[PDB]
Symmetry: C3
């Protein structure tokens, strides 16, 4: 398309919402291609990632970890206004794996504190894609400090299964998984720092052991458990978007399954079906579609159970509805053996 | 199905056998849905996992690591009687990834020493699935202490390749891969403990380094080598079921291939073909089908060669038959260069 | 085929070239099956793997790490002459994952210094396959010392996408990824040794931590960056072969995508499409096909960004051509926020 053609396309401004929720959108595209505008501010701030008061200097898109999920349709243009406040201390940029050229946009979006930039790219490929900050020479540090998220480029005709059958979800949640590498003092206690830069050296040596100290969903251990559990009802169709910008993960819905899973996250690649545990390599986003059949609590985890229950990668789903005894029943409840 | 309908279905009681063997079953289902009864006892006992006398307090279904493979057909009901002897010291339960609801059954099967429970669930999805103990608050510990296995839910019409061609195996073996995390004293020597609970704290800190001390097949280094090698003959079709309840693995049959591989372990997802090394994420089971064409010894390994040959993840297949020189021949046997 | 039939087949001798380049070949097979002869010498030599002067005693096929890529077509016979010079100190052999029988050929090719052997095998399965040295009792050590490479068995009719469409590449590059485990003294400085064998013990204990000290492409940090960047032009179709004989990797072309990816590396398994990051398990080779649409520098990395930018797994592609503003444009270049 020529510049004049792109300029005459209708524009839509979107208000981003905090994860795990997603901004309003239509699954089946309404009309022709559009220019969809998003605005994100970068916040460098301290966040507590566990119940022991462990602090980390996060670098967050819109103040959250992960950054929000942006949704567009194939062949729409995504136009991002990215702002780095004058109160921040580092240069940041953004690389959209959904984009083509200039290191995903990272080469055209380097902004220092007090600057802003506007980048536009055509969403030519459908699927879920990771986006993350990637400043030359400090790439892994910004990513493992939480500066990453994901976008979803829906096919214009909505989601479909392997054989053309339409798949419409009632709800969608975005689970961003993050590996943190927090330094510990000579006593095995987590260290705290005044400013982001002061933690760099120590963090890098923890990073080189390739063993995270924490692995969490939505920025903190237990962030999506208890009162913050994700919800659904029996009969509802849910799409769960999962991203990991740096490290492998293996999602599994305990008590349920992955009816249709685009483990690689690309909609033109047929989904795998009836999955128990799927695999998302570091540097990618994946999506699973499931229709709940039983009520109760479900645990959604990284199925390396140590990472899930010892490091923090575990979330809850609270589902309402009626129990189905055909699918599962307790014939004899736990009781003492009668001698 | 109503309760009265399930009650009128024919019942079949199955006697489980120790891995790597599998109980007798038919590939193509005989008739309509059935209620298939299995019984498993939980044994807490010390096992030696290597040739250095290294001991571990295993928590084993039917006394083996892995627990046995249970086989049913799609839409059959699996009814398990689970028993926790009064001589055990911990509460245990079971989560079937093949099941729908109540955390895979874990929420309905918590039994203390001296108790039993009976759980029934409909096997709605075909494929190989992991099952494991998962007590609230102590999930990874029971899993890495060996309390896991797998089940196979065969399609009613038997196995088929991507394009409807029937696949009938002559033999089937179940390889359970286990990651152990054994504590070491100040001298680098493995520690021993009186009771399961006494090893908990030390084991947990080894678990957090995410680096196992041992990675074995059938519960011990060399468990499936030498005289215990799995067997086959040239021309025979073999199905190899592989499970890993907590950690990723990458199976590879050295000297052979994976003609058809359901790496994700789900039969409704077409198999990948002609595989050299496949990948099974932690929290899943996979299956590979191969027709032997050459006699001799084959090594079946986790292809991270350090885990295979240094940590213990290596097994043997001894195959009888005649050598095929068309496929491979030594034109010039190793000999001194003639100067 | 009988011996007389194989003996009457035409023969072709191939001169191997150093990675990342590949020897001349035709994508679509010219005529019938052939016997393709390759010759490789084994070199035990010291190589420097980073800019800090870190040395390693490599064991290299044809003196390079990885060894060269050999190309044949399905049903051709590959006949390898393998030579172990009298000046080497260890016995070596070779296991072709592309081969059937005798541990991939390893059981028929054990040669001591001063010996040679000739092995022939029929390339029955199409795809990219790893090959590596595997001497009994010292398998992982030879592999992580660099003795591995890959071969490509092209379908006789050339590459095709999932639905029969022909895929013809203009260029092909072979990226061999290697994990090294270099011992460090009491001061955290890399140790040096006189002979291969003298480093064995120390290396093995680093290997058991399963954490490499370096992860590189083409044998050294930065080996494929700067002036040694791989090249292409906008509009050109490139096939990138990637292998990892021992450890998992997750390739990603920063700024681009994987239009068609045989992540498992087997051509009879349909490719995944529009990939951002794909996964190649240790013990396998994979291939990605991409058509460049934008000029500039691209980074090709293992997308665990710590392994890429801290450990060495990063390469460059320099692409010439004209920028396409439809795909991506800087609407507002980084500039100060106007207050
Ligand atoms: Cu940043
Ligand atoms: Cu589980
Ligand atoms: Cu238990
Ligand atoms: Cu191998
Ligand atoms: Cu060697
Ligand atoms: Cu990236």
């Amino acid at each position: 398309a020529t510049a004049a053609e792109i300029a005459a396309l209708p524009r839509q401004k979107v208000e981003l919402v905090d994860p795990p929720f997603v901004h309003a959108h239509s699954q089946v595209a309404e009309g022709g291609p559009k220019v969809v505008e998003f605005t994100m501010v970068i916040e460098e701030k301290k966040i507590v990632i566990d119940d022991a008061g462990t602090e980390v200097h996060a670098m967050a898109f819109n103040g959250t970890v992960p950054g929000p999920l942006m949704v567009v349709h194939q062949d729409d243009y995504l136009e991002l206004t990215l702002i780095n406040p004058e109160t921040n201390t580092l240069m940041h940029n953004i690389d959209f794996h959904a984009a083509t050229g200039a290191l995903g946009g990272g080469g055209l979006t380097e902004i220092n504190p007090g600057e802003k930039t506007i980048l536009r790219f055509k969403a030519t490929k459908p699927g879920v894609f990771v986006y993350h900050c990637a400043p030359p020479g400090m790439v892994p540090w910004h990513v493992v400090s939480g500066m990453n998220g994901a976008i979803m480029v829906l096919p214009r005709e909505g989601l479909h299964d392997g054989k053309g059958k339409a798949l419409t979800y009632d709800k969608i949640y975005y689970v961003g998984e993050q590996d943190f590498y927090v330094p510990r003092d000579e006593n095995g206690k987590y260290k705290k720092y005044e400013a982001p830069g002061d933690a760099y050296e120590d963090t890098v040596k923890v990073m080189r052991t390739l063993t995270p100290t924490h692995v969490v969903f939505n920025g903190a251990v237990g962030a999506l458990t208890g009162d913050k559990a994700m919800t659904a009802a029996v009969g509802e169709k849910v799409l769960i978007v999962h991203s990991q910008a740096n490290r492998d993960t293996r999602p599994d819905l305990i008590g349920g399954h992955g009816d249709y899973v685009w483990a690689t996250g690309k909609f033109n690649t047929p989904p795998d079906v009836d999955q128990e545990t799927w695999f998302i390599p570091g540097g990618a986003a994946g999506a699973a579609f499931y229709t709940f059949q039983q009520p109760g609590i479900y645990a959604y985890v990284n199925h390396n159970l140590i990472e899930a229950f010892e490091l923090g990668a575990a979330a809850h789903f609270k589902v309402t509805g009626e129990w189905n005894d055909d699918l599962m029943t307790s014939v004899l409840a736990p009781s003492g053996t009668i001698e």
